[PDB]
Amino acid sequence: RLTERAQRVLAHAQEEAIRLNHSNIGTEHLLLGLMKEPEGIAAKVLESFNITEDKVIEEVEKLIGYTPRAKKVIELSMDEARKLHHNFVGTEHILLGLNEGVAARVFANLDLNITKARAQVVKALGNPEMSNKNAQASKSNNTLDSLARDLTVIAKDGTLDPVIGRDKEITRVIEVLSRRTKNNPVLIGEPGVGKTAIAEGLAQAIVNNEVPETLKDKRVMSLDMGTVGEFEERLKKVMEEIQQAGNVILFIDELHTLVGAASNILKPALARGELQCIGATTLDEYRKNIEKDAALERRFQPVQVDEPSVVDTVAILKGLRDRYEAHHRINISDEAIEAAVKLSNRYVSDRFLPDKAIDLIDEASSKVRLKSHTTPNNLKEIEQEIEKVKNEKDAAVHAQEFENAANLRDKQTKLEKQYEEAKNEWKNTQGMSTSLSEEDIAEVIAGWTGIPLTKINETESEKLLSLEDTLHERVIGQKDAVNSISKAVRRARAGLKDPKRGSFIFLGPTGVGKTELARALAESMFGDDDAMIRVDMSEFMEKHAVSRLVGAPPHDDGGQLTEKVRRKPYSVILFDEIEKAHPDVFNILLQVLDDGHLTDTKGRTVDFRNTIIIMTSNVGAQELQDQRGQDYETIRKTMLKELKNSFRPEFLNRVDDIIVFHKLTKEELKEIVTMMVNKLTNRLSEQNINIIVTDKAKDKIAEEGYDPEYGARPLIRAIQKTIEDNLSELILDGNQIEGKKVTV
């Protein structure tokens, strides 16, 4: 199968060739078929060498006023074409054989084959010809309504927003748009990913002739659905007006779902197999547009749009730096841009990199602008004196007195002096000129969350290594448990540890770290104590296994965890004692842990290198008591083996470690009581109460009130009345006035 040249041109010519009792198709059928008028309306590649194509055209039309000569044309053109590496014969190659389709007259205008045509062809479509359509084998070849906003004209003006690194998307769009069935590409991603810039980028490619000119007519128009009542009716009336023009196509830049105002809005109306365009969806809109319909699904091809990388986001922001500077009237630092992109990338979990980067560069810039509102005050004081003096001279002019001698003159010259002073204060006082990187960003982010803000001042030393003391002091006992855990965390530094995957099983008494450590970890690890998520096991055991992961295997069931947990991809998930978990749960944990990913019915993949799970357990009901002469490792191995005998081995094999927790000793009881003092201090030193418990009572109390598998519970009742009622008394006392440190 050849190009459409001399195939479809002929099909059209035949529609229009019903003329002369033609014994067969002659060359003149096509030749005349290659024009709109039997006039020059004359540009074949040999027109430039020796052929008066305008005369050839008149002579061929006059001639009529395959055939044996057409066959010689076909055979010669193709044979020479093969020799010249022109696999299919086009208009610039048909000349090789055009035996019939020439001014075969005395004063002839005849074609060349392997002499000049092969050279003139380079100027024609020529060298860049791999694939199979045509060269627009015609003539010169060698209503746009308000619902069709023209982007290519804006592209031509030069005011559209370019996209960095998204040529693959434009390329794929062109390929899809040309098709008959899967022919409406859609861009996939959340808005902000760069989809709006891609749609605009297409319009730019068109005006810059980076595309074959087809889009010259099939211009980028944007669809403005209009409402402020039914409007689909208008879309249909306009669509008919546009389709009749048959030139331009309507795009969605970022968002489209099925709407109630056909769910496939305007689509059966325009289901003509033409005027293909890029639609645009997100993970959920795709589902709610295309998958939801599932009929027209056969007519779409998603084009996945990734977010720009730090390098690409920085490049667009630096390119756009001039625009932002003009609006902020400040300089925006390049370092600030690099930092804004990087620090937002670390801080924001809510948006794509361009959005979180932009939100930050405007806040950093805004702060410079607020500070720069004025000259780095004394002037204002001078102005206030000027206004005062002005008012006083008003009184001076009005005074109904006998006297520019004294009243008027005094105030007039005082004002003149102050006026010069106001000007001088401005001139010799010549906020911030330019934004900063870490300093402004730390302020913006610290403002938004604070807490060293934790991803700004973290160089991965404090939360990887110093982590051991933070976690241990938060949770007293078995520092070896803590050490194993901090090692698991530091191993992920630079991806030394599998980049796409933490997991621990915590066994022991209550009040020793089985649950306490998971929260302490979230506090340190994410700079967020509420990054810890607790999951009850009965709640998801069997009948509710479907609430752990969304199922639909057998409403919009988000389960209880998939929808909610997904909102925070920076988290510690604490599972209740797993011996209460159903094998389905363990199989789920296994599937989820591998490759670090979310296994659901939505596809909202989470890079789990940003999460960790902690599962408590009491399988080692007696084994945990080995602490009461075995060391950490020996106990660990014993509990590991028993866990293996209960939970699936494959699941268990994805666990970083089995952690030994352990009843606190008196030294440890004193340490947790001490932590209470720190808590009370944090709660009250703010009532301004500083706290020291009389030493006799302090130690006696911590030493006595223990509970082997809870924490120091017996201490509690004596203390609320001994300490809290007393601290209330300190307020009512005044001897041990708040700020002093004495209690019982």
Residue numbers in the entry: 5 to 69, 80 to 112, 116 to 159, 162 to 247, 255 to 287, 296 to 464, 466 to 536, 539 to 591, ...
Which sentences did the original study use to describe this structure?
The bacterial AAA+ chaperone ClpC associates with the peptidase ClpP to form a central proteolytic machinery of Gram-positive bacteria. The ClpC-ClpP machinery acts in regulatory and general proteolysis, controlling multiple cellular pathways and differentiation processes and is crucial for bacterial stress resistance and virulence. ClpC activity crucially relies on cooperation with adaptor proteins including MecA, that target specific substrates while concurrently stimulating ClpC ATPase activity. Here, we report on an unexpected mode of AAA+ chaperone control involving transition between an inactive resting state and a functional hexamer as revealed by determining the cryoEM-structures of S. aureus ClpC in absence and presence of MecA.
The structure of ClpC on its own was solved at 8.4 Å resolution using ~90.000 collected particles. Surprisingly, raw images and subsequent 2D classification revealed immediately that ClpC assumes a conformation different from the canonical hexameric arrangement of AAA+ proteins. Attempts of 3D classification and refinement using the existing ClpC-MecA structures failed to give a refined map, indicating that on its own, ClpC assumes a substantially different conformation. Indeed, reconstructions revealed that ClpC without MecA assembles into an oligomeric assembly made of two open spirals that interact via head-to-head contacts mainly mediated by the MDs. Additionally, high-threshold noise on the open part of the spiral indicates higher dynamics of this region, suggesting exchange of subunits. Accordingly, for peripheral ClpC subunits there is not sufficient density to account for all ClpC domains. The AAA+ domains are staggered with a rise of ~20 Å per subunit. N-domains domains are packed between MDs and are displaced so that they lie on top of the adjacent small AAA1 subdomain. The MDs coiled-coils constitute the backbone of the spiral and mediate the spiral head-to-head contacts, which involve residues F436, R443 and D444 providing a structural rationale for the activated states of respective MD mutants. We envision the helical ClpC assembly as a dynamic inactive resting state, which will interfere with substrate binding, association of the ClpP peptidase and interaction with adaptor proteins.
